[PDB]
Design a protein that fits this description.
Protein name (chain A): Major tail sheath protein
Radius of gyration of chain A: 24 Å
Number of strands of chain A: 3
Strand content of chain A: 25-35%
Entry title: Cryo-EM structure of Staphylococcus aureus bacteriophage phi812 baseplate in the post-contraction state - sheath initiator, wedge module, inner tripod, arm segment, and proximal tail sheath proteins
PDB class: virus
Helix content of chain A: under 10%
Largest sheet of chain A: 2 strands, antiparallel
Oligomer: part of a larger assembly
Strand order of the largest sheet of chain A: 1-2
Chains A, B: Major tail sheath protein
Keywords: bacteriophage, phage, contractile, phi812, baseplate, virus
Largest interface: A-B, 5 and 6 residues
C-alpha cells in the first residue's frame, strides 16, 4: 500500500545496444483531506 | 361480551408523518327484547 495502482500493460521495455529504455505509469497514493456528504431527507408512507 | 363480533381483516392502518389513519368494522351489542318459540306435534300409529 505504498502506491495506489498501476496499469500493468503500460510497463514497456525496449532494448537496443547498450541502452535499455523503460516507460511506465503509476498512480500515486493520496491521503484524504476533505470529505463532503450531501444528505437528502425524504418521506415514506406505511400500511399495516 | 361487550360487542357481538368484529372482522379482523377489516382493520387497516396507514401512517404518514404525524397522522395515523385507521379504519375498522364492528357488529354492536344488543339485549333481547322479543323471544319467540313455536312447537310442532307429531304422533306414530
Amino acid at each position: 500500500n505504498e502506491i495506489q495502482d498501476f496499469p500493468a500493460e503500460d510497463v514497456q521495455v525496449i532494448v537496443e545496444g547498450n541502452e535499455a529504455r523503460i516507460s511506465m505509469t503509476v498512480y500515486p497514493i493520496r491521503s484524504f483531506k476533505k470529505i463532503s456528504v450531501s444528505l437528502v431527507y425524504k418521506q415514506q408512507t406505511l400500511q399495516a
